[PDB]
Amino acid sequence: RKSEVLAVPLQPTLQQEVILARMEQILASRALTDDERAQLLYERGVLYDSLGLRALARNDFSQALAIRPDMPEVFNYLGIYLTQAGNFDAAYEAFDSVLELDPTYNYAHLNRGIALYYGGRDKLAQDDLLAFYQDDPNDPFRSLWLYLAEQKLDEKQAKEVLKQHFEKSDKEQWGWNIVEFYLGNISEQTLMERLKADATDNTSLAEHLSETNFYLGKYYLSLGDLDSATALFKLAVANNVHNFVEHRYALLELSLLGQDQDDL
Amino acid sequence: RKSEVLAVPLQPTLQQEVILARMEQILASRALTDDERAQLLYERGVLYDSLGLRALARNDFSQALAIRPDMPEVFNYLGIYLTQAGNFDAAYEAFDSVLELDPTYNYAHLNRGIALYYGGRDKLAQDDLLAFYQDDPNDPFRSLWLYLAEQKLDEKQAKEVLKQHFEKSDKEQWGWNIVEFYLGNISEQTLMERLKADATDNTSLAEHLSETNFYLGKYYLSLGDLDSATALFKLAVANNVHNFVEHRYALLELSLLGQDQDDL
Amino acid sequence: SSLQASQDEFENLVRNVDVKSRIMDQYADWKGVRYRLGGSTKKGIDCSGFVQRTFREQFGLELPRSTYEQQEMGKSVSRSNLRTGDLVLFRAGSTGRHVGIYIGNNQFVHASTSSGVIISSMNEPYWKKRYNEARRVLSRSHHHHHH
Amino acid sequence: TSSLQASQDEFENLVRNVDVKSRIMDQYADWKGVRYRLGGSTKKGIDCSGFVQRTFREQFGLELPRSTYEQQEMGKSVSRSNLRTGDLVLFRAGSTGRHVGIYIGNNQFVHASTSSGVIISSMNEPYWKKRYNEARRVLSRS
Amino acid sequence: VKMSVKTVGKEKVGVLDIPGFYVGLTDDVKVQLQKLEKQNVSSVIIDLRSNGGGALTEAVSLSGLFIPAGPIVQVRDNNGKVREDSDTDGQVFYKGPLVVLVDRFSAAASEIFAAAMQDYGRALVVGEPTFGAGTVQQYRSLNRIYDQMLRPEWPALGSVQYTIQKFYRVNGGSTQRKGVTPDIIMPTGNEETETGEKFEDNALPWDSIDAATYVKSGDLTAFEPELLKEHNARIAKDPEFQNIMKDIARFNAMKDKRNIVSLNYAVREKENNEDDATRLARLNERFKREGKPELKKLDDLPKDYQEPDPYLDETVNIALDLAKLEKARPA
C-alpha cells in the first residue's frame, strides 16, 4: 500500500573471494599449528557467514571447536545458527557456554535474549535484553529488541518504556528514527526520507533498508497485517546483508509465517 | 507507482553446501588424474556460479583450462564473465573458441549475441540471436533477445518481427506473456497475475520475477523512465537466482545506469 | 588501493595477538623513562607521545600526537565495562589532559610527571578524583555497520 | 563492476600477494623489540640492513646483499605515489649515510632504527618525512 | 650505445640519431640520457629522421626523461573513454633545454614525442611537418591454447595489427590529418609533397578532443621570432640553403608534367649532362669555399659518404643560441 526505497542487492566483494581462495590454499597445506588451524577455521566460518554460507560456516566452526574447545566466539555463532534453525534449548546452552568462557562478551546476552524471545520465555528474554540495554542505553536497536520482548508481556507498558528509553537517550544514532515510528512520532514517509538522507552508498542503503524493513515488518505483524509483514521481511532479506541479526530473524519470521500458513 | 509481486530471495541450499564441502575435500587429496581434476574444477566453478561467487568460479574455470585446454564449456563461462566485466572483445574471442571446439553448442551464439548487443555491434548481434532463434523459435526469450537487438536498428520493424514471431509460435511456454506485454496485448497487471498463477513454489516465483523484472526494466528503460527501470532491475536481482542471464545483465544495466549518473 | 586493503584485512584476520602482553612488552621496553613536555624519545617522553608510540609500534594504529586530538579517537566507553588496551583520559596535567592505557584490574600504564613512565592504579585517590572519560580504539570485528 | 571487473590475472596476483603484509608482520612479531647493533645479524643485536636481509630471506626467499648501499641499487626503483608493501624505503639518515626499511602500508614502515631498535614507524613523522630519499621494489613476482 | 657527454665545443650540444622506437630503445638510451641530472646540462638535440614506430609503452618511457611525470599521449577507443598514458616512475632526469629535429617521413611515436615536448614548451620543434599518423594499433597473435594439443601438424599461425584506438595530444588536438607545424621550417619542407597520410587510402578523419591538464613552460611555441629571423639570416647567408632552394624550385617546375615523362634520347642526354655539370659546379663551389682540392674526373673518387645534413648544423646553431638565451634569460 506504499512505495518503497530499493537498493542494489549486495554482491560478494572481490576481497571476500580473494581471501576465501587464499584460505583454501593455506588450510590445504599441512604446515600450520593447531591453534593457527582453529584461528583460520573461525575466520573462514566468519567469511562464509558474511556470504550467507551458513552450513559451511557452522562446519568450519565445529572443526575449530574440535581443535580448540575454549573458543567462545564459535559457541556464539553456533548458538545463533541454532536460533535460526529453531532449536532454542541448544542455543541457550551455547550462549551459556559463551558467558562461561567469557562473561564480558555482552552480545551473548543479546543473542540469548533473541533466542528466548523466539522460544516463548519472554521474561528471561526481557532480563537478557535489559542487561544488554544497560551495557549501552543509547544504542536504539537494544531498546528496540527490549521492546519486542516486553510487548509479549504488556503492550502499553512496553510502549511507555520505549518512549522513556528514547527520551533519555542522546538521540544521535539514526536507528532512533525507527523507534520514533514505533512511538507514533514520525510518519512512515518521514522515516523513509530520513533513511534516504542518511544513506551514502549502496551498501549503507542496503544496511538501512534491511534493518528498517525488518522492524517495519515486525510492526505491521503486531498490528495483524500479515501481507505487509511478509512483503517487508522479503524486502529486508533482499538486501543480501547476511550477517545482520535483522536479516537472519527476518528469514526466521518468514519461515514462521510459512509454517502458520501451512498448518491451516 | 505500481504494486509488485515479491518472492523470498533464494538462499543457498543444503545440497549445494554439502557438494561444495565434499569437492573441497576431494580436490584436497592427491589421488586424482588431470582429466578428473579439470572435470571437478569445472563442476566446482559451476557451483560457485550458481551461488554467485563469480570470481571463484572464474578461478576454478581458469585452472581447469590450464589443465585441459580443450574445454568449450569453460570458454563459454569465461566469455559470460567477460561480458559481465564489460570486456566485449575478449568475450567474442572466448565464444569463438567455444564454437571452434564445438559448433553445436548453440547457446554460445546467444551469449555472443548478447555480448555484441552490449558492445554496440547491433547487426552482428542480430545475426547471432537470429541464428539462436532459428535453433528453436518457440522459446520466447530467444525472440525477446532478438527484439532487444533489432530495436537498436528499426523500432517499428523490430516490434513487427516480434509480433510475427509470437504469432508463428505455439504460444505454449509462459514467457510469451512477456512478449505479449511487449506487443501491447495484455496489461502489466495481467502479466503479473499470470505470473502469480504460473508459479507453484517460492523458487519458481523467484525465477518468474527475475526474468519478468529484467525485461520490464529494459522496457521502461527504452521508454525513458530511468527510475522504473532501476527499480525493476533491483527487484530482479533481489530474487538471488545468480544463474539467469536476466540476473547478470540486470546487474550490468544497473552498473551502466550508475555510470551514466556519475559522469554528470 | 585494492592489494593494500586486501593485505590489511588479511593481516587483521590472521593476528590473534594478546593486547595485555604487547602493552606490557612496551612497558618493559619503556619503564622508567623521564617525563618531558613535547618529547617523543627515550631521552624524555610525555603521556600522549607514549600512548602514540605504544599503539603504533605494538599494533599499528596511527593515533594523533596531542592528548586533545587523542581524546576524540575511537568510541567512548563506561568504567563498568572497560577492557584491556583502552585508553583512559584524566583531567589533570600541565595541559589539563592526561592519557594512560588500561591493562586490567584497575591498572593503567602511563607516562606520569612523577618518576616518569610507570604503572599506576585506577583506584588511587589522585587519579580516582581526576578521572574524565575512557575510549576504546582496539576494536573486535565489525564488517557492516548498523548505521 | 565489482569482482568480475578485476581480470583473472589480477585475481591470481591478489591471491598470491595478499599475505605479504602478514608475513612481514610475522617477522615483526618474532623480531619486535630487538636491540640495534651495527653489523649485527642476530636477535642479540641487529641493524636495518641485516633486518631487511633476514626478513626478505626468511619470509620470501629473496637473498639481498648485506650493506644498505648495495640494497639501494637492488631491484627496480619505485615512486612515492605508487609503492606497495614489501618495497624498500630509503632514508638519508647519515649515521652511516643511508637507512633502509620495509614499507607495510598506510605511510608505515618496519625498520631497525638506531634509537629504539626494530620497530614500526610512520612516513609522516617529521624526522622521516623530512629525510626521505628513494624507494626500491625487490619482490618481483607478479 | 656510446655515452660521451663531455663539455666540448661551446656547450654539450649533441645529436641523437634514432632509427626506430625499439622496445629496447629506452633500455639502451637510459645509458645515454640518464646520468646527467645533478651535473650541468646543455642544449642537446634529438633527431627523428626516417623513423619507424615500434612501441607505445616504450615511447612513453622514453618521453618521460624530459618531462617530470606527465601525460605523454591520450588514447580514445570507439566508445569514447579517454586514457592518458604516462609511466609514474621517475622525474625529469635530463633537466636541460632540448631541440627536437624531425622530418616529414617520421614515425607516429616520434610525432607523439615531439608533440609532448611542444605542448610542454620545454623543447623546440625544428624540421619538416611530419607524416601525420594518429591511430594506435594492436598487434595480436592468432594462436589459441588448444591449437598445439589437437592440431599438432599445423605450422605457426600469423598475427594481426588492427587499429584499436586513436591518439591525441595533451593540448587537445590530434596529428591524424594536420600533423605538427614546427616553429623552425626547413627549405625542403616548404614544397607541397605528394606524400603523407592524406594520400593513404581509407585514412581516418580529424577530431580534436578537449585539452588535457599540463603545465606549459612559456608560450614560446606560437611566438618564436628570436631564433626565426636569426636562422632566416643563416639560411640566406649561405649558398647551401640557396642551392637546396634551387633544387626545390626544380621540383616545383618538374611536378607540373611529372606524371607523363617524355623520352627523347637527345633531350635526355642533354638533361643528364646538365645535371652532371650542375653537380660538378656545386662540388667545385663547396671545395673553393672549404679549401679542399677540386675534383676533375669521376674515376678517382669512389663511392663514399656525401654531406650528411646542413639542417643538423642549423639545429646545432639553434641550440647554441638557446644556450645564449638561457645564459641571458634566467630573469
SS (H, E, C) chain B: CCCCCCCCCCCCCHHHHHHHHHHHHHHHCCCCCHHHHHHHHHHHHHHHHHCCCHHHHHHHHHHHHHHCCCCHHHHHHHHHHHHHHCCHHHHHHHHHHHHHHCCCCCHHHHHHHHHHHHHCCHHHHHHHHHHHHHHCCCCHHHHHHHHHHHCCCCHHHHHHHHHHHHHHCCCCCCCHHHHHHHCCCCCHHHHHHHHHHHCCCHHHHHHHHHHHHHHHHHHHHHCCCHHHHHHHHHHHHCCCCCCCHHHHHHHHHHHHHHHHHHCC
Pick the catalytic residue: D24, D46, D48, D138? Answer: D48
- Rounded to the nearest 10 degrees, the angle between the axes of helix E239-254 and helix E225-236 is 90
For chain B, the straight-line distance linking the first and the last C-alpha, in angstroms and rounded, comes to 26
Task: Give A-chain residues touching C1 at CB under 8 angstroms.
Answer: none
Q: Could you tell me the resolution of this structure in angstroms?
A: 3.5
Contact by Cβ (8 Å): C44, C36: yes
Active site residue D138: no
Contact by Cβ (8 Å): B215, B207: no
Angle, alpha carbons E17-E22-E25 (nearest 5°): 65
Looking at the complex, does the CB of residue B52 fall below 8 Å from at least one CB of chain A? yes
Contact by Cβ (8 Å): A212, A191: yes
* SS3 category, A112: helix
Query: What nine digits make up the cell of A157?
Result: 507498558
Contact by Cβ (8 Å): D138, D64: yes
B229 to chain E nearest CA, in Å?
Answer: 23
Contact by Cβ (8 Å): E25, E62: yes
Minimum Cα–Cα distance from B78: chain D residue? D8
Pick from A171, A175, A244: nearest CA to A203: A244
Looking at the complex, does the CB of residue C3 fall below 8 Å from at least one CB of chain A? no
Minimum Cα–Cα distance from C3: chain A residue? A15
Q: Do C9 and A15 touch (CB under 8 A)?
A: yes
Which of C2, C6, C143 lies nearest to residue A19, judging by beta carbons? C6
A172 to chain C nearest CA, in Å?
Answer: 11
What residue spans of E40-135 are helical by DSSP H?
56-63, 108-120
- Residue E323's CB is within 10 A of a number of other CB atoms, namely 19
The method recorded for this entry reads X-ray
DSSP β-bridge partners for residue E124:
E99
Task: Give the integer Cα–Cα distance in Å for B175 and B211.
Answer: 9
Active site residue D52: no
Active site residue D85: no
- Rounded to the nearest 10 degrees, the angle between the axes of helix B122-135 and helix B107-119 is 160
Task: Give the integer Cα–Cα distance in Å for A77 and A41.
Answer: 13
Count of A–D CB contacts within 8 Å?
Answer: 24
Contact by Cβ (8 Å): D103, D109: yes
D123 to chain A nearest CA, in Å?
Answer: 26
* SS3 category, E17: strand
Pick from B144, B157, B149: nearest CA to B128: B149
Q: Do E89 and D81 touch (CB under 8 A)?
A: no
Which of B6, B21, B59 lies nearest to residue A21, judging by beta carbons? B59
Minimum Cα–Cα distance from B93: chain E residue? E144
Strands D132-137 and D99-103: unpaired
Angle, alpha carbons B144-B147-B151 (nearest 5°): 145
Which regions of chain D does DSSP assign to beta strands (E)?
41-42, 45-46, 76-78, 88-91, 99-103, 108-113, 117-122, 132-137
Angle, alpha carbons A176-A179-A180 (nearest 5°): 90
- For A206, phi then psi, to 5°, come to -65, -40
* SS3 category, E75: strand
D70 to chain A nearest CA, in Å?
Answer: 34
CB < 8 Å from B in window 108-137 of A: none
Looking at the complex, does the CB of residue A131 fall below 8 Å from at least one CB of chain C? no
Pick from B81, B73, D6, D25: nearest CA to A17: D6
Q: Do A15 and C5 touch (CB under 8 A)?
A: yes
- For B125, phi then psi, to 5°, come to -60, -40
Looking at the complex, does the CB of residue B85 fall below 8 Å from at least one CB of chain A? no
Looking at the complex, does the CB of residue B162 fall below 8 Å from at least one CB of chain E? no
* SS3 category, E11: coil
**Residue B25 CA: distances (Å) to CA of A34, B59, E36:** 18, 18, 61
Pick from E16, E47, E48, E20: nearest CA to E33: E16
Query: What nine digits make up the cell of E119?
Result: 605542448
DSSP β-bridge partners for residue C100:
C88
Q: Left, alpha or beta for D33 (phi > 0: left; psi -120 to 50: alpha)?
A: left
Pick from E291, E129, E322, E317: nearest CA to E234: E317
Minimum Cα–Cα distance from B70: chain E residue? E146
Task: Give the integer Cα–Cα distance in Å for D71 and A173.
Answer: 52
D9 to chain B nearest CA, in Å?
Answer: 10
